[PDB]
Amino acid sequence: MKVRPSVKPICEKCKVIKRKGKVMVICENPKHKQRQG
Amino acid sequence: AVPKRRTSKTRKNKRRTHFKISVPGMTECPNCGEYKLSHRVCKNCGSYNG
Amino acid sequence: RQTFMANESNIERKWYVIDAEGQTLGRLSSEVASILRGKNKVTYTPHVDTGDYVIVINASKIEFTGNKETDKVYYRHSNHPGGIKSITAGELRRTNPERLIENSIKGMLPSTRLGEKQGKKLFVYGGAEHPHAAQQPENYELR
RNA sequence: UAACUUGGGAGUCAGAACAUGGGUGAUAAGGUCCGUGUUCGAAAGGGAAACAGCCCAGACCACCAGCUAAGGUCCCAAAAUAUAUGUUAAGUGGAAAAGGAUGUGGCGUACA
RNA sequence: UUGGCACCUCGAUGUCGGCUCAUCGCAUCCUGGGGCUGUAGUCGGUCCCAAGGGUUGGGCUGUUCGCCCAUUAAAGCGGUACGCGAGCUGGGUUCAGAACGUCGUGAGACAGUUCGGUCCCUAUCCGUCGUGGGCGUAGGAAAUUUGAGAGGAGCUGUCCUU
RNA sequence: GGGAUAAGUGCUGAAAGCAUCUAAGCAUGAAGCCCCCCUCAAGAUGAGAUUUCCCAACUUCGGUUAUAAGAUCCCUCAAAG
């Protein structure tokens, strides 16, 4: 899990979502998961 | 060490509340007739009759 | 000088029974506060108590708005180093519903020697059964 | 409604904050040095929770009379739980940046 | 942390390093719970949540620092007038003696070293730790109790089996 | 051992015919939070509860006296001070 102020897609498959007042990117590849956008 | 403030009369009289004197335990003697301290010997006559 | 002054030889205090079923906490405590102070009587006197008695039933059924059931917390210090406790408003409604309304109304009264006497005319219960039927309480609707 | 001239008697030569035009410093300081206005100094009263310099306003004395200013009208605490139309769900309101997000409004230009 | 400013104290707010007793922040050294790996296992790297409890003994220098020896699950970093002298030490740094190097014609001075050299107070108020006397609780008494609310305690190693 | 949580993993499910832990609805989850363990606690003026004991003579103050059940004075001592 990467916790960074700047979260943006690192690939075209990754999707941007918002759950519990947090900008979260989820990608099928495990390394591209991000949080705290 | 040294008092910062002087003591007032109101404060001084409250501390001396319990500074009292005791009343002794005295009863009338069976034979002397005078007053006597319990468990002591009558000064007036000299009898105890324990 | 002709202003009237109320004394303890012409004051009449009655008994009320208010219901807290389905009511906002803050908007219900602000009205009960004026009754306990006597702000609704035409013979109001500042240096004497002239309010009435109030009974609150169905206290456990008060209502909140928004997320105040988790974000609103109550703190208290025990005067010892590091002795600060805490409890959320949602968890207090489920355990001591009467202390929730009792402390919410006590904070809307003056902190004087007369205000502490006016805060003892309040009675809060979690159900609908009060033991003060002898006092003959009369129903009251909030304005 | 002042100004000027002659004569008698003085005090003052340690100033401060706020707004604004500049130097200096680091477009730091409740810093420092000049221009301009106000207040304090020597000014009580109301507001800013407390708070010489900020806002309103200059107390001859008495009254259990009335209308207003700044700021206000749920309770502490005097006055609308006023009316009309819209926005925000975060306790935002009631502390801050570069950057990052089909969060949600308004006005303009075959897609699975 | 080293500085800038000079607003409080010069009819006086006592220093550095310890010792004794602690408290509190989390930017987490150890213990607990989780992602991702360039994660086979045994061991690690990095980042997130978590402050309940723990977090050694000596050699050398007056010291803080710092190095070294032997250990430990670990030998965390900061604040409180650099916590603390009406609690205590006086080894360094600011008294009067004397000496060396250096500077001065000189009396003398350190951009430097060396040996020596008085630390005083019976606690008035608040605060803190113990222990009694009054009055109250709608008659006067003797015993046994509920617990609103506070305080205390919280750590961890090595073996054996699977 | 119990009950709710943090970071996490989730189960269903639309907004957005698919996807998606969330926007409604169900779970799981820390030496930490509230209990469980030990001590003090009704001056908790909101002063609580239970068992037992005592309860008569008067000018008829809407009072008073002396007693009662109990507790002390004084005295011999300690396991306490």
DSSP for chain C, written as a single string: -------TTS----EEEEE-TT-BHHHHHHHHHHHHHTTT-TT--TTS----EEEEE-GGG-B--TTHHHH-EEEEE-SSTT-EEEEEHHHHHTT-HHHHHHHHHHTTS--SHHHHHHGGGEEE-SSS--S-GGG--EE----
- Alpha-carbon span A32 to A12, nearest angstrom: 11
CA→C1' distance for A4 and E4 (Å): 37
Q: Which residues contact B1 (CB under 8 A, 6 or more apart)?
A: none
Q: Which residues contact C82 (CB under 8 A, 6 or more apart)?
A: none
Does A3 count as an annotated binding residue?
A: no
- Alpha-carbon span C100 to C64, nearest angstrom: 12
Q: What are phi and psi of C120, to 5 degrees?
A: -90, -5
- Alpha-carbon span C79 to A30, nearest angstrom: 51
Cβ distance C78 to C40 under 8 Å?
Answer: no
A2 touches strand E (CB under 7 A): yes
Residue C141: closest CA among C29, C16, C53, C25: C16
Q: What subunits touch chain B, counting only 3 or more CB pairs under 8 A?
A: none
CA→C1' distance for A9 and F30 (Å): 32
- SS3 label, residue A36: coil
CB neighbours of residue C5 within 10 Å: 9
Element of type H or E holding B10? helix B9-15
B18 touches strand E (CB under 7 A): yes
Does A34 count as an annotated binding residue?
A: no
Cβ distance A17 to A25 under 8 Å?
Answer: yes
Query: How was this one solved?
Result: cryo-EM
Sign for the pseudo-dihedral over CA of C133, C137, C118, C28 = positive
C67 touches strand D (CB under 7 A): yes
A13 touches strand D (CB under 7 A): no
In chain C, positions 115-134 with C-beta closer than 7 Å to nucleic chain E are none
Q: Of all nucleotides in the shown strands, which has a C1' nearest the CA of B23?
A: F73
Residue with tokens 């002397």: B32
* Tokens read off for C80: 């010892």
List Cα–Cα distances, C66 to A22, C24, C70, C114, in angstroms. Answer: 19, 12, 10, 36
A19 touches strand E (CB under 7 A): no
Q: Please report, as a single letter, which amino acid is at residue A16.
A: V
List Cα–Cα distances, C61 to C22, C77, C90, in angstroms. Answer: 6, 29, 12
Q: What subunits touch chain A, counting only 3 or more CB pairs under 8 A?
A: none
Residue with tokens 């102070």: C37
Angle at A24 between CA A19 and CA A26, to 5 degrees: 115
- Alpha-carbon span C57 to C127, nearest angstrom: 6
Q: What are phi and psi of B41, to 5 degrees?
A: -110, 125
A3 touches strand D (CB under 7 A): no
Does A27 count as an annotated binding residue?
A: yes
Does A32 count as an annotated binding residue?
A: yes
